[PDB]
Design an enzyme around this catalytic site. Structure first.
Site, PDB file in Angstrom:
ATOM      1  N   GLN A  31       0.829  -1.285  -0.226  1.00 44.92           N
ATOM      2  CA  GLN A  31       0.075   0.059  -0.117  1.00 44.92           C
ATOM      3  C   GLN A  31       0.875   1.296  -0.004  1.00 44.92           C
ATOM      4  O   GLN A  31       0.488   2.191   0.438  1.00 44.92           O
ATOM      5  CB  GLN A  31      -0.945   0.099   1.244  1.00 44.92           C
ATOM      6  CG  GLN A  31      -2.044  -1.125   1.193  1.00 44.92           C
ATOM      7  CD  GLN A  31      -2.613  -1.267   2.278  1.00 44.92           C
ATOM      8  OE1 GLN A  31      -3.779  -2.029   2.572  1.00 44.92           O
ATOM      9  NE2 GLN A  31      -2.442  -0.329   3.413  1.00 44.92           N
ATOM     10  N   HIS A  32       2.108   1.215  -0.483  1.00 44.19           N
ATOM     11  CA  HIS A  32       2.711   2.389  -0.807  1.00 44.19           C
ATOM     12  C   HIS A  32       2.251   3.204  -1.658  1.00 44.19           C
ATOM     13  O   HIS A  32       2.468   4.519  -1.741  1.00 44.19           O
ATOM     14  CB  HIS A  32       4.455   1.981  -1.016  1.00 44.19           C
ATOM     15  CG  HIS A  32       4.361   1.203  -2.365  1.00 44.19           C
ATOM     16  ND1 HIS A  32       4.251  -0.289  -2.204  1.00 44.19           N
ATOM     17  CD2 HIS A  32       4.588   1.655  -3.679  1.00 44.19           C
ATOM     18  CE1 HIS A  32       4.695  -0.571  -3.668  1.00 44.19           C
ATOM     19  NE2 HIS A  32       4.494   0.472  -4.575  1.00 44.19           N
ATOM     20  N   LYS A  64      -5.477  -9.093  -5.729  1.00 45.64           N
ATOM     21  CA  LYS A  64      -5.905 -10.300  -6.474  1.00 45.64           C
ATOM     22  C   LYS A  64      -7.164 -10.769  -5.928  1.00 45.64           C
ATOM     23  O   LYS A  64      -7.301 -10.638  -4.637  1.00 45.64           O
ATOM     24  CB  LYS A  64      -4.912 -11.375  -6.803  1.00 45.64           C
ATOM     25  CG  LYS A  64      -5.400 -12.145  -7.756  1.00 45.64           C
ATOM     26  CD  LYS A  64      -5.389 -11.746  -9.119  1.00 45.64           C
ATOM     27  CE  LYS A  64      -5.838 -12.743 -10.184  1.00 45.64           C
ATOM     28  NZ  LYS A  64      -5.959 -12.164 -11.379  1.00 45.64           N
ATOM     29  N   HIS A  96     -17.472   5.990 -11.281  1.00 47.90           N
ATOM     30  CA  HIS A  96     -17.190   5.281 -12.243  1.00 47.90           C
ATOM     31  C   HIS A  96     -15.688   4.840 -12.507  1.00 47.90           C
ATOM     32  O   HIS A  96     -15.462   4.005 -13.374  1.00 47.90           O
ATOM     33  CB  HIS A  96     -17.743   5.788 -13.506  1.00 47.90           C
ATOM     34  CG  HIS A  96     -19.387   5.534 -13.612  1.00 47.90           C
ATOM     35  ND1 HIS A  96     -20.569   6.793 -13.280  1.00 47.90           N
ATOM     36  CD2 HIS A  96     -19.991   4.529 -14.165  1.00 47.90           C
ATOM     37  CE1 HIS A  96     -21.435   6.063 -13.539  1.00 47.90           C
ATOM     38  NE2 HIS A  96     -21.318   4.771 -14.094  1.00 47.90           N
ATOM     39  N   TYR A 118       1.000  -8.098 -35.300  1.00 44.91           N
ATOM     40  CA  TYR A 118       1.902  -6.858 -35.196  1.00 44.91           C
ATOM     41  C   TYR A 118       3.487  -7.222 -35.609  1.00 44.91           C
ATOM     42  O   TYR A 118       4.159  -6.311 -35.864  1.00 44.91           O
ATOM     43  CB  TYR A 118       1.860  -6.398 -33.710  1.00 44.91           C
ATOM     44  CG  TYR A 118       0.606  -5.542 -33.597  1.00 44.91           C
ATOM     45  CD1 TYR A 118       0.492  -4.181 -34.125  1.00 44.91           C
ATOM     46  CD2 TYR A 118      -0.451  -5.930 -32.973  1.00 44.91           C
ATOM     47  CE1 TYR A 118      -0.707  -3.430 -34.039  1.00 44.91           C
ATOM     48  CE2 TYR A 118      -1.555  -5.127 -32.639  1.00 44.91           C
ATOM     49  CZ  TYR A 118      -1.884  -4.024 -33.120  1.00 44.91           C
ATOM     50  OH  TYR A 118      -2.881  -3.272 -33.026  1.00 44.91           O
ATOM     51  N   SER A 152      -4.737  -0.236 -18.702  1.00 44.83           N
ATOM     52  CA  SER A 152      -5.536  -0.053 -17.459  1.00 44.83           C
ATOM     53  C   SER A 152      -5.400   1.305 -16.702  1.00 44.83           C
ATOM     54  O   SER A 152      -6.242   1.815 -16.223  1.00 44.83           O
ATOM     55  CB  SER A 152      -5.712  -1.475 -16.575  1.00 44.83           C
ATOM     56  OG  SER A 152      -6.113  -0.867 -15.356  1.00 44.83           O
ATOM     57  N   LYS A 160      -8.159   8.280 -17.672  1.00 43.89           N
ATOM     58  CA  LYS A 160      -9.222   8.744 -18.529  1.00 43.89           C
ATOM     59  C   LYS A 160     -10.452   8.858 -17.933  1.00 43.89           C
ATOM     60  O   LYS A 160     -11.258  10.107 -17.782  1.00 43.89           O
ATOM     61  CB  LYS A 160      -9.723   8.190 -19.845  1.00 43.89           C
ATOM     62  CG  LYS A 160     -11.207   8.204 -20.220  1.00 43.89           C
ATOM     63  CD  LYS A 160     -11.168   7.526 -21.607  1.00 43.89           C
ATOM     64  CE  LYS A 160     -12.608   7.497 -22.025  1.00 43.89           C
ATOM     65  NZ  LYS A 160     -12.742   6.453 -23.144  1.00 43.89           N
ATOM     66  N   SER A 184     -12.682  12.013 -22.952  1.00 43.08           N
ATOM     67  CA  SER A 184     -11.585  11.193 -24.012  1.00 43.08           C
ATOM     68  C   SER A 184     -10.611  11.939 -24.443  1.00 43.08           C
ATOM     69  O   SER A 184     -10.347  13.169 -24.336  1.00 43.08           O
ATOM     70  CB  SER A 184     -12.419  10.759 -25.214  1.00 43.08           C
ATOM     71  OG  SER A 184     -12.638  11.716 -26.199  1.00 43.08           O
TER      72      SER A 184
END
Lengths: 487, 487, 486, 485
Positions: free
Chosen positions: A74-75, A116, A185, A252, A371, A377, A383
């Protein structure tokens, strides 16, 4: 097993760095080796929570479902982690994965902790309504105890949970608990575009692994040791496993001139020295079933791990490479596209054979980076690039006009030169501008800058092609530096 | 075996007994209530379990990691209640078992609380006071940040390994850092010293509860006729199997109302005197030096006091002190289970066969939790009990008693009769009025009301002297009623 | 001789007296107990103090900047009590001294509050009634945002220069602007009118407090024997200096129980009558026109009343009244400090020299603090006292009397009803109200505090110096609160 | 001392601005002059607070510490201030400094209020374990009364404190009170780079001073009025004091084509007519002690304040210039580096012989501008330019490719305009956040200088830039009150 290898990696990385850390990283009385309890603080997981909540089945039935959540460090205030729906999740598994996540985040320099989750549920047993109800109740139970808030913890999708599951996560915190929170959100990542998603989310990991491979190939010093040098071109690569990561990586990578010799999967392999078109194979796979039987493709008898190639990408289940299989391989570069496909023993053989192994802690962090961009964003409430595309376009046109006029009023006796025609590639980029380009540019910049750091660390600590310990040392150094000047 | 299996078996037996009568004329459809009774499988497991790992700095400037646990069983009533233990053998199973037991224990005596328990893997007699304070401070902060300490969420209490000193720190910590803006910040913990907001008569709570629980069954004519002895405390003998807090405080109150003690045990040799043992002189001798060993006016008792001749034997030393081996040799008539489960389940069968009643441990020692509930109420009131009513009640009593003599003198006429003088007991009660009187009266009323409910439940299901399965049935029915009528 | 110096000296003397035996008598190592007495060092200074400067718009459109202060002293108990003064004499040091005094005043009475005090540098006589409302509302606005008005943080009270209107104007402002979501928003202040959520008996609280304080010490046989009078009220004359709320409400209750008042002083000539003065007639005369000057029932006594022959003196007018000059010329054997510090410390030496008891002002005038505490509790409870128990108690009493009647009729067999209550009890039953409950609570609190003060004087071998005994009591209580805190 | 003068500056500014503001700033019954009570509202400090909190020392003896903090104006919600660790602080000092901070923030259009704090204690005789306790307790006490919040007040380090304290404050706030706030770490500016700091913070004030001097030098009209040629290369400068600001200002001034005639400090001055290399001087100073005994320079004897330089930078203690040495100076331009290094009396003499003095109110705003940028970054939760560097690189390369293709089409050749210059390549290769911070600082300083120059002519002011800046700040802060209610 996977639970002990992460601890072994941390233990190996925490002894190499201590000698240099105690000497040239403190500003008394030689009582600084006792300050190395910071490593002991970093080592274990901080919080683990176990749940047991009831749901109502379709046929008027009551069942109890148990789930787990672990927060390693939790740093950094926002903890990041995924949610897994499976019938074999255990406390130790989420502990190990949360411990891995914090180092993964620290490597690519994103301000996130480690987390997790896991729910003891088989997804292919419940109606969509029951799955939604389970998801809602799990969200409420986690949020009530401080495990969901946008400034505390942010879940992320996994292999067994799609974006549909996390569309339900969003409109349960924003409707019950975070009603007064303006950033309600922003507590989830991976939601659909309509609910506040980010463009280019799907192809994140493929672009990440492609950039990670590209950065090391164009390194003359490292490629000189392997005795191949140049860069791309005439390189032969084989991929095993044809998931999302493998498909996008192959696309790619082939776009830049690489040739795909063979493709593996759970079913029979595909072998073609003439090269395989990614688009045609993808269309065949999507058309019906697997790639078992493909025109212009001779099936490969035997394992493809020992096939002659230059780059091998094992994007499949864990423990794909063992000590026995190690001597038989022939690829000079292994790009770990999955979570730990190489046993610790096999690393000794690879080092002894002078073979480069790109760590998995580094290669597949594109998803985490995207992520992070999505979280930013959602915080920004707009956007990317909406207020700058037209401005840049006008500036570029003005600059081209200025150049054209300056050239014209220099030879203004005979000539109608028009140096104001952008190239076709530039015109396509101008007309098709969107936030996808911004996301891809940010990902490429991040994975180049974080590759330079790992190369510098490996050079400094006087170690060869063993890049995994270099990555672990870099992450441990960053975390210790964060704790050092905090108290 | 372990207490987890014991409590699981008790719950299973109670649920099996109560299921048949919980549907017939208790619920208002195609016999689907046999599926609605699946609530019983929801109450059984613990809702939340939390695991901690936090750092402290020792006195010599060395870091170390301490781990602890906190489990909450039920949340049908929001404020959870539980203790905190400082021991090196605390485990997740034990804390869950105690948390499960606490909900039923609270439900029996009708206190509106949930159930919880805490444990810290630490040895208290290994640290200085400063580092113990640091450990408690950090534990409270970590437990508060995750939502486990709030006055309206969860409230702790002192166990045998902790005292009021360790929880004045808890109250100060919560009131200073997190609950700064909460008017009920100091109501986040119980067992505090009287200066910090404690309640009078807290030390003598469990003994008073044990005494009242015994006295409730002593005056029951039906049970005494069934097992064949005279009611009341006329000529009764009780042997105490431990001189701890509960035994010492309960043993005085029995003697104050005509009961005689003949034998007292401890971790050392017992002392036996058929003439009787004076209460007040015993604790003075114990406090003077060591233990009761060598106490004058009491010949030592060879053998085990468990088989000694008595009637109200009180096994209040430890657990698992009555197995199937020593059970056949017991010559008592009533066993007051003052400790926390010292009787094996197999011994219950032979005790029932011998026709000897055993007061359940789920009922006899609820005085502590009742007084904790009263203390919580007092902290929610911000005023001591009886502060605004003592003088008013005294004036009303004086006026009412004055009126009688005025009326009598009006009737009879001329002498100066004086019935306005109260007795010595009433004068002492008037002059010695305090909060402890209110607390003791409330405790007595609570246990009096619980005893009759236990009687009625035992009579309803055709149970004999098996009071344990009746108290468990009471708890299960009361906790099921809340769930059923809420949804 | 400012109040800051006197309170500092009092605290220093109390600390010096208490520490020497507090070292080891009650503690639990290795004689660091003397070095852990930085707690007494923490006690002395004020924890917080805040100065303000806020603008208002006058009725004529002009602008003006107004200054204000507020100080918090201890914060060992989270809520803080204090008053607000509207005068052009308030300074930071005076506010700090008053807060320090209020902390010990609360401590000695066993009420869980801190110490606070506020002041505004305005003259209410130079402002329209409309301007005062907006000044007060803006003051509350500025004071709330810094955490100084909250019901669980700091609770003010009226003072000499303020009334119920200001309390309403601050209560509604807090409940409508900042504490909108708070459920105890209206509990943020005390002294509000009954309509707004006040309590009964607020006005007559101080008089009852001083009366009970005198009554508790009058019946003390040990003090009365060594002082030289007969214990108990009766054939005892008293005089009162200054005739305000406290003086009137003390004289009424003193006369009601059988004490003859012979002299009354004020800012003008005094009135003397050996026979006695009726409080009702005097109150009516004072309310009718002007002051009590020229009362047509006695004579205008000449000279200072402090030298008048009596038994109880009530210096309830102003401070610094009894100095060393007039100290040996008084004749009363008991002085009741109605006001705040009417006796200079130099004068107290003379009284202790010739065994003249002096009731401390710290303990005497705490009735207002107690009733404010009761009002705060009532606002917390959201219900007036004795609303769910009057009829229950009446029915229980009637049933008890009927039981006595029926039991007596069984022994002797015609009607012999012991059912009629006394007139004093019948009137009490009919006129039950929360005023009775609050008065009973005040009486009980004063009675219990007087004996607790009496204990310490015997504990430390102190004589008739009750002021130092009360100060030591407060110091010991606050030190305990810090000690078990951690 | 340093409060009467700052009060007099505001008094003079208000007297100057009142007539124009009441006459030409509105489109009723001559009652608008009565609305000038807003000016008297602005002057006094709004809130001040005093503290007394206990700590326990290493030996176990308890001590009591006193602390102060003042908030001047609340016309904009977040207030910016500083923390002083010295046994010379007083309520008057912090009040005056907060009042000055208000106008300093207002001049450069930084949306912050005014604040200042100080703790009466000597850091010299305290251990590192005790200073942390003092800082944490001070932060907690200041937080519980609404003086630390991210949207309330943002403390900053001062000369007597360092970046170590800011990390302690940020850690304490984010763990006790601001636990539920997403912007908990934005409550303090000046944190280390690993805790939320920004690159380029160390060289803020010197770069700001250089930018201000450069902007006033290029103004042709001011140079013509003063009476010497414009441009920058031919000028010479002398500094006084070798702190951070002096060192960085000298570095940048030399890097942009200036010669350092002399350098002064607490010890003797160092002089060399051939100029002094800042790198060598810095290395010599960091090697041992002060700059005394520096080779390749003469040991100047006397006072450098009277040297025959062109521009002077008094970056030293206050009141370094008075009436005694006012007529003996020969510098054409005085650039105030520290806070108030000249007395108001000497301003009259300087104006008498057209000697331009640059106000300390404006030339000292680099450290507050960079602090504002750091606060913005802490709010944004992302470094500057992370998502735009590689997009801009591709956009820049595409333009060069287009020019190359068009020229080849017109002439054809193998023309190669794709290669950028040797400096643009280094710029794009080494792009980082420091570039963005420096560009923003330069833009802010340029705009502020242009604004104050414009306001100087409007009120028919001469070469007095101090009163022009004060009038500008007063006019800027007046509108917020005026158009609010």
């Amino acid at each position: 097993n996977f639970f002990k290898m992460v601890e072994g990696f941390f233990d190996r990385g925490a002894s190499i760095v201590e000698d240099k850390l105690v000497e040239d990283l403190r500003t008394e009385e030689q009582k600084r080796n006792r300050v190395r309890g910071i490593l002991r603080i970093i080592k274990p997981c901080n919080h683990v929570l176990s749940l047991s909540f009831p749901i109502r089945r379709d046929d008027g039935s009551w069942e109890v479902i148990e789930g787990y959540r672990a927060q390693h460090s939790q740093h950094r205030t926002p903890c990041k982690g995924g949610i897994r729906y499976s019938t074999d999740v255990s406390v130790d598994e989420v502990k190990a994965l949360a411990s891995l996540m914090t180092y993964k985040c620290a490597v690519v320099d994103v301000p996130f902790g480690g987390a997790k989750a896991g729910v003891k549920i088989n997804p292919k047993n419940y109606t969509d309504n029951e799955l939604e109800k389970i998801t809602r109740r799990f969200t409420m139970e986690l949020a009530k105890k401080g495990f969901i808030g946008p400034g505390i913890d942010v879940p992320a999708p996994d292999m067994s949970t799609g974006e549909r599951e996390m569309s339900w996560i969003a409109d349960t915190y924003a409707s019950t608990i975070g009603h007064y929170d303006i950033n309600a959100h922003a507590c989830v990542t991976g939601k659909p575009i309509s609910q506040g998603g980010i463009h280019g989310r799907i192809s994140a990991t493929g672009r990440g692994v492609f950039h990670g491979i590209e950065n090391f190939i164009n390194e003359a010093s490292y490629m000189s040791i392997l005795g191949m040098t140049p860069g791309f071109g005439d390189k032969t690569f084989v991929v095993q496993g044809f998931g999302n990561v493998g498909l996008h990586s192959m696309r790619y990578l082939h776009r830049f001139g690489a040739k795909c010799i063979a493709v593996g999967e759970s079913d029979g392999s595909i072998w073609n020295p003439d090269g395989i078109d990614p688009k045609e194979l993808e269309d065949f796979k999507l058309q019906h079933g697997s790639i078992l039987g493909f025109p212009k493709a001779k099936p490969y008898e035997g394992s493809i791990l020992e096939a002659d190639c230059d780059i091998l990408i094992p994007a499949a289940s864990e423990k794909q490479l063992t000590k026995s299989n190690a001597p038989r391989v022939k690829a000079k570069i292994i790009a770990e596209g999955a979570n730990g496909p190489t046993t610790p023993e096999a690393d000794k053989i690879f080092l002894e054979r002078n073979i480069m192994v790109i760590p998995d802690l580094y290669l597949n962090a594109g998803g985490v980076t995207v992520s992070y961009f999505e979280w930013l964003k959602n915080l920004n409430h707009v956007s990317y690039g909406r207020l700058t595309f037209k401005y840049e376009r006008d500036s570029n046109y003005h600059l081209l006009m200025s150049v054209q006029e300056s050239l014209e009023r220099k030879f203004g006796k005979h000539g109608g030169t028009i140096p104001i025609v952008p190239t076709a590639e530039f015109q396509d980029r101008i007309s098709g501008a969107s936030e996808k380009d911004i996301v891809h540019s940010g990902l490429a910049y991040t994975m180049e800058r974080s590759a330079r750091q790992i190369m510098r660390t490996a050079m400094k600590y006087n170690l060869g092609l063993d890049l995994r310990t270099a990555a672990y040392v870099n992450a441990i150094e960053k975390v210790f530096k964060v704790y050092n000047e905090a108290g």
